[PDB]
Amino acid sequence: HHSQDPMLSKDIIKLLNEQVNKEMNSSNLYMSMSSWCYTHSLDGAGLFLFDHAAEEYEHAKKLIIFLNENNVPVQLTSISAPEHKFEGLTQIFQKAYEHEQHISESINNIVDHAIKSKDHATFNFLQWYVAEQHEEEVLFKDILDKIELIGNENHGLYLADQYVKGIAKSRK
Amino acid sequence: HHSQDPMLSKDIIKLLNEQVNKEMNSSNLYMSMSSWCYTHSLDGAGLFLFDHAAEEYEHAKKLIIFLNENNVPVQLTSISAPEHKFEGLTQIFQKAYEHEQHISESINNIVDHAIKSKDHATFNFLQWYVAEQHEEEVLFKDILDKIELIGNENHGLYLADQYVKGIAKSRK
Amino acid sequence: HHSQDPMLSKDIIKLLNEQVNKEMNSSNLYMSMSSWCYTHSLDGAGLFLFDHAAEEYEHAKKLIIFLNENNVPVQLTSISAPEHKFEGLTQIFQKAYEHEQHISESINNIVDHAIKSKDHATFNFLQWYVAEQHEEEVLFKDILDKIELIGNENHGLYLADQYVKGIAKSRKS
Amino acid sequence: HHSQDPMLSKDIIKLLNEQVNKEMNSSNLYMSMSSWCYTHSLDGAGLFLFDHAAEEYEHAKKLIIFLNENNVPVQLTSISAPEHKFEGLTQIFQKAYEHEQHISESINNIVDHAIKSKDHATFNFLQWYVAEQHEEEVLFKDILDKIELIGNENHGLYLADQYVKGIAKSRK
Amino acid sequence: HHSQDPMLSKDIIKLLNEQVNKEMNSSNLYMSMSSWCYTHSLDGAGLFLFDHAAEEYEHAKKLIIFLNENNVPVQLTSISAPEHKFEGLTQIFQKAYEHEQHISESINNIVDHAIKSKDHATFNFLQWYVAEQHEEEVLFKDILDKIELIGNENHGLYLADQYVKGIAKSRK
Amino acid sequence: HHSQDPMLSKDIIKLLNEQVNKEMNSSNLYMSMSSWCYTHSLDGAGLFLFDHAAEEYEHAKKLIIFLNENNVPVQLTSISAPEHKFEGLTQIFQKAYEHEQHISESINNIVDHAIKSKDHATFNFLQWYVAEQHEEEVLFKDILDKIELIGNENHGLYLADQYVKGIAKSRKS
Numbered sequence A, B, D, E: 001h002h003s004q005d006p007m008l009s010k011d012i013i014k015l016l017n018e019q020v021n022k023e024m025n026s027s028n029l030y031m032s033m034s035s036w037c038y039t040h041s042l043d044g045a046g047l048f049l050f051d052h053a054a055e056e057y058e059h060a061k062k063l064i065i066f067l068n069e070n071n072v073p074v075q076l077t078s079i080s081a082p083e084h085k086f087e088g089l090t091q092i093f094q095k096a097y098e099h100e101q102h103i104s105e106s107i108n109n110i111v112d113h114a115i116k117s118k119d120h121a122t123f124n125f126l127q128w129y130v131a132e133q134h135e136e137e138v139l140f141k142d143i144l145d146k147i148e149l150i151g152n153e154n155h156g157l158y159l160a161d162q163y164v165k166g167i168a169k170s171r172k
Numbered sequence C, F: 001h002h003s004q005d006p007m008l009s010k011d012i013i014k015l016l017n018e019q020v021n022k023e024m025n026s027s028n029l030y031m032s033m034s035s036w037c038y039t040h041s042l043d044g045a046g047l048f049l050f051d052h053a054a055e056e057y058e059h060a061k062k063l064i065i066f067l068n069e070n071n072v073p074v075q076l077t078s079i080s081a082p083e084h085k086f087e088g089l090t091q092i093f094q095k096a097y098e099h100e101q102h103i104s105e106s107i108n109n110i111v112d113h114a115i116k117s118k119d120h121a122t123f124n125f126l127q128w129y130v131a132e133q134h135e136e137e138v139l140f141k142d143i144l145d146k147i148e149l150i151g152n153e154n155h156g157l158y159l160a161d162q163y164v165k166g167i168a169k170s171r172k173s
Ligand SMILES: [Fe+3]
Pocket: A100, A103, A133, A136, A137
C-alpha cells in the first residue's frame, strides 16, 4: 500500500530530528547532574534537576508527535554518555545555564529556517517551545544568580540547596 | 562535607544501572518502531508503540529514583541508534514480543540476585516492576496473537491496526 | 494460525494445574462437610463451610485466569467423591484444619519452586494467595480451638454452632 | 440429638443430586472449552466460556442450598475429567449448543417429576432455573448461528471472536 | 482443654521473638536520644526521635500480633537500659544511622530464613516491615547527610534542628 | 551553649522517671498475660490484655512528654522479663487486679508528694492519669468479679472469655 510523502522539507526534517536528539541528550545530562547532587547531599538540586530532565524528554516527545503527524520518519541517533563528574553545585549550574543558552540558540535557528522557507505550519507549532524554553533559560539564570549571591561560605551550600528545593516544589 | 556511602552492594548497583540503560534503550526502540508504523499508515500501532515507549522511560525514572534514594550514583551509558528499518507490522510485533521476553528475563535476574545477597529492600522495591512488566509481556503476546489471527489478506492490516488502536485508547 | 507458546515453564505449569484441581477438590470436600452439618442441626457450621467451599472455587478461578493469560492449557482432572460420613462437629473441624495445613504446604511448595526457577511473575502473582490461605489456616485453627474449649457437655454443640454462625455472618459483611 | 428427616421424596432427592453433579461437570467442560479458546488466540470466546462456566457453578450452589434447606444430604460423586480435545471455534459451539440442549432436557425432566409427585415446593423453586437455562440455550443457539453466518474464510475467526467478546462484556 | 500447637517453626519463632525485643530496645534507645536533644535545646530533633521511638514500639506490637495469631508464645526477655551518654547532635544521628543499618540487617536475616524454610506466610507478612524499615534507614541517612552538610559553625545546630523539626511535623 | 535547668524538683523527677519505668514494666507484663491467653484459646482475654498493654505504653509516653517539656532528663531502666507461666484465666485476672491496685497506690504517692512539695504544675498535670487509672482499676475489679461469678464449670471459661471479648471490642469503639 502507498503512504503519503513527508509533509516537511528536507532541511526542516534534519533540524527537527537533530532537535529530538538534543532534547534526549539534555534529559541524560540533567539526570546525571541530578544524581551528582543526590550523592553529595544536595537533594533540593537533585529533585529540581531530575524534574527538569523529565521535562526535556517531554519536549522530545512533542517534537516526535509533530514529526509523526507530518509523515516524517524519526531519526534517533547515537549519543555520547553524559558527563558524570562535577566539581560542585556552582559548576553544575554554570554548566546547565550555558547548556540552556545553547538549546535556546538551537530553537532560534529552526524558527529562523521555518520563516526563510515559508514553513509557517512549523513556525506556528514551535511557539509553545520558544515560550517554554525562554522560561527555562530565565529559570537557570535566576538559580545561578541566587547560588552566586549566597556563596559557598558557612551554610551557603545548604541555603542554596533549600532555595532550589523550594523552586522544585513550587513548579509542581 | 561527608555524604553517606551507597546503601546497595556493588553487584546490585551494577544490575540496577544496567537496567536503567536497558529501559532507555527500550524507549528509543519503541519510538523507532512507532515512527515506522506512523509513516506506513499504521497510526493505531504508531500510537500504541509511542505510548509504550513513554512508559519505558517512566520505568527508567522509577529506577533512577531508587538509586538516588540509596545514594547510588546513576551511570548513564552511551546511546546507540535504535534499529529503524522494519519489514512490516507482524515483524515489528514479533521483534517487540521477543524484546519484552528479554526484559522480563533481565528483571527475573535482578530479583534472583537480590534474594541471593539477602537484599530484601531491593526485592521488595522491584515488585511493582515485576507485576507491570508481566502485564506488558502478556499484552505483547496478545497483540501478536491477534495480528497473526487476522492475517494479511485484503483489509487484514487495517483490521489489525484498528484493533491495536482500540487497545492504545483503552490504556489511556 | 499460530498462537504463542505457554509463557511458563513445564514444572510451574504442572504445579499450577495441580493446584487448580486441589482447590476444586477442596470445594467439594467442604460442600460435603457443610451438608453433614446442615443435616445434623448445625446450620451455623453448615453456612460457614458452604461459604468457605465457594471461596475455594473462587481460588481455582483465579488460578485458571493466570493460566489463561500465560497461554497455558488448563488440565482439569477427575474429582474424587469427597468423604461424606463424619463422626461429629469436632471431627469435621479437626479434618478441616489438617486439610488447611496441607493446602498451605502445597502453596509453599509452588512459591519455593517459582523462586528456584527464577519465575518472579508467578512468585509475585501468588502473594494474594499466600496471604488469603494464611488467613484461612488461622481461622480454622481458631474455630477448632473454640470448639475444643466449649466441648460437647450440656448445650456445647449449640454454643459452638452459634459461635461459628457468628463468624460466617461476619465474613459476609 | 435427633434431626428432622429429609423433606423431599427419594426420587426428587436423586434427581436433584444428579443435577448438582451435572452442573459441576458442565462448569469443568466450559472451563476446558474456554482454555482451548484462550490458547488458540480466541480470547473473546475464552472470556465468554469462562464466565459461563462460573455461572454453571452458581447453579450448582443454588441447588445445594435448596437441598440443605430441606435437610437433604448432598451426594457429590466423582466428577470425571472434561473433554479437552477440540477442532475449532465452530465445533466448540456446536458441542456447547448440544450440551445446553441436554441440560434443558434434564431440567424439564425434574420439573415433570415434581408435577407427577405433587411436589410443588420443588416445582416453584425450579422456576428461576427453567427461565435462566432457557436464556442460556437461546444464547448458545444465537452464538452458533452467528459463527456459522460469519464463517472461517479471510478474517472470519477474528470477526466471530470479537462478536462473542462483545456478548461476554455485555453480560458482565 | 487442648489448644493447637504453634504454627511456625522453632527457628522462625526464635527469630521473631528476638525481633520483638530488638524493637522494644530500639524504642528505649530513641526515647533516650530524644530526651538528650530536648534537654540540650534541640526540640526539633527531640520531637523527631520521640515520634520515631513510638513507631518502633508499633513495629513490636505488629510482630506480637503475628505471633499471637500463629499460637506462638511471646517471649519477652529483659530489656537492658539504653545508652544515655551522648556528645552532640551529629553523634546521635551517626549512632542512629548505624543502629538502623543493624535493624535492616536483622530483618533481611529473618526474611532469608523464611525463604530457606519455605515459610511463605512469614515471608509475605514481613513485606510491610521490609518496606517501612527501608524508608526509615533512608530517612536517617538523609538527616545525617543534612546535619553534616550544615555543620556546627555559627547557627549550624539551630539550622539543623529546625530542618529536623520540619521533617518531624511533615510525618505527623 | 547553655540550656535551662530541669524545672521540677529532684524528688519529683525521680518519682516520675520511676513511674515511666513502672508503665513500661506494666506494658510487658500485660503482653505476656495476653500471649498466655491467646495460646490457651482465650482470644477475648488475649485481645483485651493486648489493648490494655498498649494503653500502658501510651501512659509512659505521656509522662515522657511532661518530663521533656520541663527539661528533665528521662532515665529509662532495665525492664525485667515479665512472668510468663500462669495457672489460668482466674489467676491472670487476680494478678492483674492486684497489679492495678499497686499502680493506683504508686500514683497516689506521686500526687501526695506534689502536694507536699507545692508542685501544682505536676499535681494539675497528673489529673488525667489519676482519672484514667481509677477507671482501669475499676474495670479489672469488674472483670475479676465476672470471671468469679461465672466460674469454670461446664463452658465457664468460654463464657468468661466471650464476656471479656465484648469489653475489648466496646473499648475500641
Ligand atoms: Fe530547556
